[PDB]
Design a protein around this ligand. Structure first.
Ligand SMILES: Cc1cn(-c2ccnc(Nc3cc(C)c(OCCN4CCCC4)c(C)c3)n2)cc1CN1CC(O)C1
Length: 265
């Protein structure tokens, strides 16, 4: 799972840019066929362990609706090589594809729920589940990306305990610093609202404490325009305040599954 640098060929263009460095499109030369890849390149304080951690999480993961890691490449700077989802972030796609029918959005978010169902079974917490971190291969095929804040849970516990996306975070994450798969279900609820709002930002114009204050009164984001009423119930079900009463992805996937096939039938 260590890749040869002379086989890789990177573009000059950047896809994304953070403190890590860059994300660039490229081509990894396989047996005969050449595979297209998205490569996360590094920019020097020992934040190289953070990248190794992300690679180590993706190494263990293996699922249709998760971004696959091809391997690591030590050359000039550290590089996390992944398979290429050509259409990009879900939020940005839906922003500039308003024609996308509501059936198609149910399909795309149900795919995310199945990836998180696997993530829950595999005992990993994502901790950054947003519409920006869902990448599209096709209009009808999504993958969950960005495992930089992801943690593998121990066999005895069922939460991790700790620059946060407060708008995607559950009450227990803000108050108690406790991250479980139920905390990701909360984030999936915000991700659903994002998708049915066509990539609109949640809690628009509000600060973290104002969002925290709003949610404590029992006030939740309203049903976005054209969103099916059964899908909006699932958002509010994902936004259960109590951690224990909130459903896991098994339940979230099962409702999205059943509802989806009453639309296509
Ligand atoms: C670690 C990582 C892997 N990737 C990946 C992983 C696999 N595939 C891709 N493909 C991809 C990724 C992006 C960010 C993307 O948008 C760049 C295209 N946008 C259009 C105009 C500005 C850039 C497109 C069209 C394709 N990215 C992205 C990231 C960074 N995450 C994505 C999240 O938004 C920040």
């Amino acid at each position: 799972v260590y890749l040869d640098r002379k086989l890789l060929t990177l573009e000059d263009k950047e896809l994304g840019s953070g403190n890590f460095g860059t994300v660039k499109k490229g081509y990894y030369q396989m047996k005969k066929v050449v595979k297209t890849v998205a490569v996360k390149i590094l920019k020097n304080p020992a934040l190289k362990d953070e990248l190794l951690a992300e690679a180590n999480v993706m190494q263990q993961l293996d699922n249709p609706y998760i971004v696959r890691m091809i391997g690591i490449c030590e050359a000039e700077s550290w590089m996390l090589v992944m398979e290429m989802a050509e259409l990009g972030p879900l939020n940005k796609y839906l922003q500039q594809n308003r024609h996308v029918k509501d059936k198609n959005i149910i399909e795309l978010v149900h795919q995310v729920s199945m990836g998180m169902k696997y993530l829950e079974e595999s005992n990993f917490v994502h901790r950054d589940l947003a519409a920006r971190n869902v990448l599209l291969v096709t209009q009808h095929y999504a993958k969950i990306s960005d495992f930089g804040l992801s943690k593998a849970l121990r066999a005895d516990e069922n939460y991790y305990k700790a620059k946060w996306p407060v708008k995607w975070y559950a009450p227990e994450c803000i108050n108690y610093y406790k991250f479980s798969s139920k905390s990701d279900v909360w984030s999936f609820g915000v991700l659903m609202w994002e998708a049915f709002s066509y990539g609109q930002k949640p809690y628009r114009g509000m600060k973290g404490s104002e969002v925290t204050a709003m949610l404590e009164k029992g006030e939740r984001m309203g049903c976005p325009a054209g969103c099916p009423r059964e899908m909006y119930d699932l958002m509010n079900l994902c936004w259960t305040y109590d951690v224990e009463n909130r459903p896991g992805f098994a339940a979230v996937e099962l409702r999205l599954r059943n509802y989806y096939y009453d639309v296509v039938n």
